[PDB]
Amino acid sequence: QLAACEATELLPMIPDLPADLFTSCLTTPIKIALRWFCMQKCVSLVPGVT
Amino acid sequence: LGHLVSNAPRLIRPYMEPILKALILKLKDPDPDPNPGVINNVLATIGELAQVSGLEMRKWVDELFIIIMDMLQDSSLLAKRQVALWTLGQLVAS
Amino acid sequence: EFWVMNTSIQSTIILLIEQIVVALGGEFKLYLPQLIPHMLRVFMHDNSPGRIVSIKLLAAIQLFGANLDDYLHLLLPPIVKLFDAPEAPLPSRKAALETVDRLTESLDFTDYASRIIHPIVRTLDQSPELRSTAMDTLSSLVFQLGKKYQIFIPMVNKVLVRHRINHQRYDVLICRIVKGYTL
Amino acid sequence: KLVPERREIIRQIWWERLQGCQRIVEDWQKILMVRSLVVSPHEDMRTWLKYASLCGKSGRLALAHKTLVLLLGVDPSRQLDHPLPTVHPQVTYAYMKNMWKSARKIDAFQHMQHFVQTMQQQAQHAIATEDQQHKQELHKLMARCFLKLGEWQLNLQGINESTIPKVLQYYSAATEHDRSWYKAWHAWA
Amino acid sequence: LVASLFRNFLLAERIMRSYNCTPVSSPRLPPTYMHAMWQAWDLAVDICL
Fold this sequence. Notes:
This is part of a larger assembly, with 2 copies of chain A and 3 copies of chain B. Chain A is mainly alpha-helical. In chain A, 36% of the residues lie in helices and 4% in strands. Chain A contains 2 helices and 1 strand. Chain A has helices at 21-27, 29-39; one strand at residues 2-3. The longest helix of chain A is centred in the last third of the chain and has 11 residues, at 29-39. By secondary structure, chain B is an all-alpha fold. Chain B has helices spanning 2-7, 9-12, 16-28, 36-53, 61-72, 81-93. Chain B is globular. The interface between A and E is medium-sized, with 26 and 21 residues. Chain E: Belongs to the WD repeat RAPTOR family. Chain E: It is found in: Lysosome membrane; Cytoplasm; Cytoplasmic granule.
């Protein structure tokens, strides 16, 4: 089994991530891996990447 | 950051712009005057950052040059002029 | 705007943060760095009777969870400076130890093995009052580090034999590390 | 001597640095001597030419000759017979303006004609498409040659009837090879 | 397919963490979010874009 979330928790509603977040990780890793890279404070030191 | 630049140059040469902006923007602020050592150690770093970069850091030299020469005259931003003159020398060298 | 070094407002504002963090959850990570300058200014100096302002703020920091990731290196030093310093009134000191215990359950501490361990070791010597508390911090810190702890075992052992200290949790984990099989 | 990447950089700086400095020969000698610790003159050509030029404008024409004959690689004071080598072309050109300034004037002119006969051969034959920067600088040279030929020819013969078709054939050929260059047009005019 | 899912699930565990989720798996894995080979990926990506 594989399950997005713990029994307590609610999934994120955050406008720039997809609603499919656990599926998208599971089956399009590179696409969200790159988009999630872009949302961090890590990108402060890669200027000219939107 | 000074040490990390000088010692591991291969790491820094891609992240030159970000580091250098963050450093320049220390020198431009009005309220890091309560500690002299921030301004000193920022300038010391720019010296070493200059050393590593070389021509890569050409376009930023005019910006720094104004800043540094403005510090040299009127020591209210009282860096040890030893450090400012050293950096100036380093920019022009590199 | 309305943070000042006065018990009056600070209490309430900190209770506000407590409710914001739980509201936003993952989203709070963005707004955290606007507040860190004030937080570090609270620990650094505080006139509060029995340092209770800083206790409440510790009790706030307990709730940040994974938000605190990118800013632990800022925020962990002044926490440590409470549980090491002789002057500090015992209740505050306890909260700081128990705080590091909470944070262990939802962050990584492998960078800060040396920052945390040496002061725990120091606290075990100087003050006998927090020997149970500090052991329950260390035990969990060991649990989180795993075999990365193997360096420190002997060094720490040399205070553990000195004052004859026994925790199930600690002893279990050390024996478990040396033999190699964690739950 | 330490940093093997900062080298091209440093030579450029050494060049730029030098041109602010005062144009007196001993000063340059000192400063050059310093660079001679780690740069042979088979590398920093455009300083050593400029060095020779400074000697020429201060009347140390023997000193200048010595510098250029060092750069050329072989001697044309000794052989007054054979043709001046072109393999370092800007250098050769420098040899002749020195040569003229030291009054082998008729022989300077004589060589310069061979120079451009050979140099334009080194364009129209030897222009394979890739060497089109080489021929670009070589044209900005040829026009500097052609223009000298005219200027000299008048100081030799004079402005009358027979000489004028030639000199205009020269300057007009200069202005053809170096479209933009001020002096070629101002000459021709 | 299972191997592909669990490989990728490691990425989910790392991301969803930063938004107060924790994913769950029936063969229960250990926590891999802190594991230092991620900071290699981070650099690898950084350079590569």
